[PDB]
């Protein structure tokens, strides 16, 4: 519900014709805000790989995939982003999340803050739920142990929107103004 970038599976093919009857049917996994963007990414991949353009092809399915459950997991996401003066950069990162869509949305925000890369310059190669004992990052492995505990400090507690005072008495909750 919270994450953007839903999980889409796009199935398509080149239109049947002479000199190429019964063309191959391809499958594509993409993470996009809506199915219009999902189909746009599918044809960009088809154009640069199979030399097939959207004008001469058709889409057979634009289904939304379903995830397993609501447990805590480890996700490995290998991603690539383009920039000038550096070309293409490939990396593998690990995240903690609940579903594949959430992990990939985290990765997109992470690349924005740490490397200043926008959505259309980023290509996702794969996402997989890996077990413990084979994650290579300490910022993820520190949540594995049982009996894990920590306190909440430096909290900023804001009141519900209905209460929301402006001036309050020094030694009481009297709410002088508003």
């Amino acid at each position: 519900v919270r994450p953007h970038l839903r999980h889409y599976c796009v199935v398509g093919r080149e239109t049947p014709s002479e000199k190429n009857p019964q063309p191959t049917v391809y499958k594509f996994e993409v993470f996009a805000p809506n199915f219009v963007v999902a189909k746009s990414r599918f044809w960009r991949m088809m154009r640069e790989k199979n030399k097939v353009k959207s004008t001469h092809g058709d889409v057979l399915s634009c289904k939304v995939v379903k995830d397993r459950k609501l447990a805590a997991r480890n996700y490995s996401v290998d991603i690539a982003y383009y920039s000038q003066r550096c070309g293409y950069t490939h990396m593998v990162k690990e995240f903690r999340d609940v579903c594949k869509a959430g992990a990939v949305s985290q990765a997109y925000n992470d690349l924005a803050s740490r490397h200043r890369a926008r959505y259309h310059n980023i290509e996702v190669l794969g996402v997989k739920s890996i077990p413990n004992h084979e994650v290579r990052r300490l910022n993820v492995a520190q949540f594995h142990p049982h009996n894990l505990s920590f306190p909440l400090l430096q909290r900023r507690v804001k009141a519900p929107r209905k209460d929301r005072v402006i001036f309050v008495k020094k030694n009481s909750k009297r709410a002088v103004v508003a």
């Binding site: 430096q154 900023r156 005072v165 402006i166 001036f167 309050v168 008495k169 020094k170 030694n171 009481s172 009297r174 002088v176 103004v177």
Partner: protein, 221 residues
């Protein structure tokens, strides 16, 4: 202020003795300077009378060296041909707060000038403000909801000293005297506070049996 003979004579005929307008007193200890000024300025424009005390305890984000340099840059500005017409650089903490609030008001219309007239801005808690009533705070600028713990901050009084203010010792001497007098008085009347508390208790078992149940249902007894 300073009622002339016209005012005293009119009050004598009419029978009036005293009058006090509705005023809010804000304790400015541990408050972010910019956030408190913005909240107060909007309330002034909405027709409120505000008195702020302890203006020497306002805090500014950053180190004391950084903020002192910022003031020395402001002090450098003056009308070269006639400095007595140029910008005026006030030095007391209470004057600095009023200047900050003034820059957040339309100060060249009669509406803004009237709004600025409704702020007093004392230093410490003077004798004419101690017994007026309970003080208030602004939770949106309390600096324990605003600053991260590890960041250095400046106290306004310390920064106002070292650039020209020469009443820091006077203010701290008067504040310490106020604490002792207020502390002595508050320890007194502990008997009447306890007596009233022992009166609300045992008031139950004297009230009718139905009103106590209603009090229990609403979590008041």
């Amino acid at each position: 202020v300073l009622p002339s003979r016209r005012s005293l004579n009119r009050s004598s005929r009419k029978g009036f003795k005293k009058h006090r307008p509705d005023i809010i007193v804000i304790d400015l200890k541990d408050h972010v300077l910019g956030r408190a000024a913005a909240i107060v300025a909007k309330q002034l424009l909405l027709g409120k009378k505000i008195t702020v005390v302890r203006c020497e305890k306002l805090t500014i984000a950053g180190s004391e060296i950084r903020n002192k340099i910022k003031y020395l840059q402001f002090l450098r500005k003056r009308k070269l041909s006639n400095p007595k017409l140029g910008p005026f650089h006030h030095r007391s903490p209470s004057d600095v707060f009023i200047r900050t609030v003034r820059s957040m008001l339309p100060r060249y219309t009669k509406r803004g000038q009237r709004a600025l007239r409704q702020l007093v801005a004392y230093e410490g808690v003077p004798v004419n403000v101690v017994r007026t009533g309970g003080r208030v705070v602004i939770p949106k600028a309390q600096r324990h909801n605003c600053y991260r713990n590890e960041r250095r901050f400046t106290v306004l009084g310390n920064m106002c000293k070292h650039v020209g203010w020469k009443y820091s010792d006077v203010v701290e001497k008067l504040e310490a005297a106020r604490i002792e007098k207020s502390g002595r008085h508050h320890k007194k009347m502990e008997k009447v506070r306890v007596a009233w508390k022992n009166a609300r208790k045992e008031a139950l078992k004297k009230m009718p049996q139905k009103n106590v149940e209603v009090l229990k249902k609403f979590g008041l007894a």
